[PDB]
Amino acid sequence: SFVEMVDNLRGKSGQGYYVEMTVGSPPQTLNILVDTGSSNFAVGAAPHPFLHRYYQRQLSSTYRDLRKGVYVPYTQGKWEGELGTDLVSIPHGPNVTVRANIAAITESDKFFINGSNWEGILGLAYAEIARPDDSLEPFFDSLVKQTHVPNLFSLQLCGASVGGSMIIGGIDHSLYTGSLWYTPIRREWYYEVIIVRVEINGQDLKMDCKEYNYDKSIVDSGTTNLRLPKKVFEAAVKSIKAASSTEKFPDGFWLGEQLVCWQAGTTPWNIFPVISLYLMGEVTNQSFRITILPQQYLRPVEDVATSQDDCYKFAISQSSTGTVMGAVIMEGFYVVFDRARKRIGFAVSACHVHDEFRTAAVEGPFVTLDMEDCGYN
Ligand SMILES: COCc1cc2cc(c1)C(=O)N[C@H]([C@H](O)[C@H]1CO[C@@H](COC)CN1)Cc1cccc(c1)OCCCCN2
Predict the structure, then answer these.
(1) Catalytic positions?
(2) Whether residue 280 sits in one domain with residue 168
(3) Domain coverage including residue 224
(4) Residue 135: phi, psi to the nearest 5?
(5) Of the candidates 111, 131, 149, which is a domain's last residue?
(6) CB of 290 closer than 8 Å to CB of 195
(7) Angle at CA of residue 219, ends 213 and 221, nearest 5°
(8) Are residues 77 and 170 in the same domain?
(9) Is 373 a catalytic site residue?
(10) Which residue among 92, 137, 265, 317 is least crowded, i.e. fewest CB within 10 A of its CB?
(11) What is the CATH number of the domain that holds 291?
(12) Residue nearest to ligand 1 atom 21, measured at CA
């Protein structure tokens, strides 16, 4: 019954994927960012230079004020607002209506993005990281509690405008090929997983696998980049530099500051390596790997000059809060957030990344010893 939800996501490259939602009675329509890296449902509720519309509580007869304030800090952006509840629907989703907590955003700093076409954010992670505390029930928990929608969703994010699907309540098997491979959700707060091995062009990075998950690894549709802990980032960039040393790149390209360009249609894909992330599996001593192409971590950006060249930003960057498996990792895969069984599944997406000689993949089974040692404590 999921066909109604296929292709219910839109966005601009690097500016997030959003789904259409209605809040209030009568329904007010808003585009809402889909974010598995946070747990608050919040909407613009006051004018802002980057908002074309916003939630007007006064016009909703079903609005209820919770008389508590709230703030959520993200990596760089932040907002504060007033908590309340209201009726919410998803037009291209399940045919249900829920009373959900809504943070009405009244003030913000570097949160809304100019031209992103979304006006709010839907945090799909667990209550443990909700603000102000874990008693503010997240949207998806409300949806499951108040309806019969099964306790899972899946995200199919497609690359180069962007689109995709959020299948709410199940798995749509026409959106992927091959088998689904599942990794345990290590803890219900972020969607935390355990990376047990990293390979670049087939060569093991040969680090203590604890380094990969220091201090955690998460699956985050609300972040563009693959973000890596400092030691892992340095090892990965060194190795990526070595593979592509045929060409010289500005020192600021590797830091995400300067873009690189080539004559349109001459991007030298073959000099950049594939990256394989091995994830903890479902059975003892078993893992699986997902393989990432340079077409995923070299993100296309608009040509800032007058050239008709292809230009790219390096979409692997350094982190101090653990690994983030962001949108560039998720693009091309069908990712199943199986909350009911505490696991996350990966499969090759119908919109998977295409090279002539290489292909993004999800492969298993593999044997990996002492996977338990890879978690950080
Ligand atoms: C590389 O660093 C900078 C950076 C880049 C991007 C997103 C974030 C940060 C970000 O903050 N994402 C947020 C995501 O909840 C994270 C935040 O830090 C962690 C959670 O803490 C609560 C991990 N989950 C969600 C978010 C917020 C504001 C704007 C966004 C997304 O716009 C989406 C388009 C841009 C995506 N790219």
Answers:
(1) 35, 220
(2) yes
(3) 150-377
(4) -85, -10
(5) 149
(6) no
(7) 145
(8) no
(9) no
(10) 265
(11) 2.40.70.10
(12) 74
d(CA 88, CA 141): 13
Experimental method of this PDB entry: X-ray
Helix (H/G/I), strand (E/B), else coil: 211:
helix
Please list the residues that pair with 301 across neighbouring strands: 311
35 lines ligand 1 (CB under 6 A): yes
Distance CA 205, CA 268 (A): 24
Residues 165 and 94 in one domain: no
User: Where are the alpha helices (H) located in the chain, listed in sequence order?
Assistant: 139-146, 230-243, 294-297, 327-330
- Ligand 1 atom 24: the closest Cα is on which residue? 37
Is 220 known to be catalytic? yes
| Cα distance between residue 245 and residue 79, in whole Å | 43
Token pair 């091309």: residue: 332
Q: Which of 101, 123, 149 is the last residue of a domain?
A: 149
Geometric angle at alpha carbon 184, from 179 and 188, rounded to 5°: 135
* Total number of residues shown for the chain: 377
Quote the tokens at residue 33.
């960012």
Q: Do residues 270 and 357 touch, judged by C-beta distance below 8 A?
A: yes
If one counts every other C-beta atom within 10 angstroms of the C-beta of residue 186, the result is 18
Q: Residue 142, Cβ neighbours under 10 Å: how many?
A: 17
Distances 105 to 36, 79, 212, 370 between C-alpha atoms, Å: 19, 7, 35, 46
User: Contact, 112 vs 44, CB < 8 A?
Assistant: yes
Of residues 333, 366, 330, 320, the one with CA closest to residue 199: 366
Task: Considering only the C-alpha atoms of the chain, give the largest distance between any 2 of them, rounded to a whole number of Å.
Answer: 64
How far, in Å, CA of 225 to CA of 312, rounded?
13
- Whether ligand 1 lies within 6 angstroms of the CB of 319 is answered as no
Question: 297: part of which helix (H) or strand (E)?
Answer: helix 294-297
Residues 101 and 194 in one domain: no
Count how many domains the chain has.
2
Q: Is the CB of 38 under 6 A from ligand 1?
A: yes
Q: How far, in Å, from the CA of 226 to the mean position of ligand 1?
A: 12
How far is residue 85's CA from residue 140's CA, in Å, rounded to a whole number?
Answer: 14
